[PDB]
Symmetry: C2
Subunit: 107 residues, 2 copies
């Protein structure tokens, strides 16, 4: 059990301004600058019913990557990871989050 991904989708609460949504993304970002375990941070916004209409109202998507299920646990119970979770989850109107061990292989 070595490489695990953290994929979050959310929607934001309609009351929040962009300035605030921006400050929240940015904080998620430089989480890397405080948490060493956190690794391959990517975010982005669903390209709409235009392309494919199965976002069920989810708007954003965020990937974080880790070098051992052990590094993932150490992070998720650390001051910063918990600190930042109080900022972020309270701003979500929809939330869904999968950690999985990364698998390139079929069955």
């Amino acid at each position: 059990p070595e490489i695990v991904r953290h994929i979050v989708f959310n929607r934001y609460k309609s009351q929040l301004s962009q300035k605030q949504i921006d400050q929240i993304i940015a904080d998620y970002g430089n989480l890397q600058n405080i948490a060493p375990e956190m690794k391959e941070w990517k975010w982005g916004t669903d390209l709409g019913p235009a392309v494919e209409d199965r976002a069920d109202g989810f708007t954003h998507a965020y990937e974080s990557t880790f070098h051992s299920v052990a590094d993932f646990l150490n992070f998720f119970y650390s001051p910063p990871a918990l600190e930042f979770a109080k900022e972020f989850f309270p701003a979500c109107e929809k939330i869904v989050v999968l950690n999985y061990i990364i698998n390139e292989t079929f069955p």
Copy 2:
């Protein structure tokens, strides 16, 4: 480039055999061969509530990559990915798909 990302979450109907679930995960990985646009395909099952409890009853996760959106649409309509679609979305009892372009942003 505008690297996109085709991230899927799902849960399969409870009536399908694991055999037939293992089947479908394999077809999804074997569209990477019958259309060269889909490009960094990886999967995993959710690690359960000891790690975290916010997966909302979705079991599996699937990644891809495309190097543009037109790639994705040629791919989306090709008889392979239109065929695999007739297999996956009825198997699916829950399903959410998010297509998006990359960002680091702030070092960049």
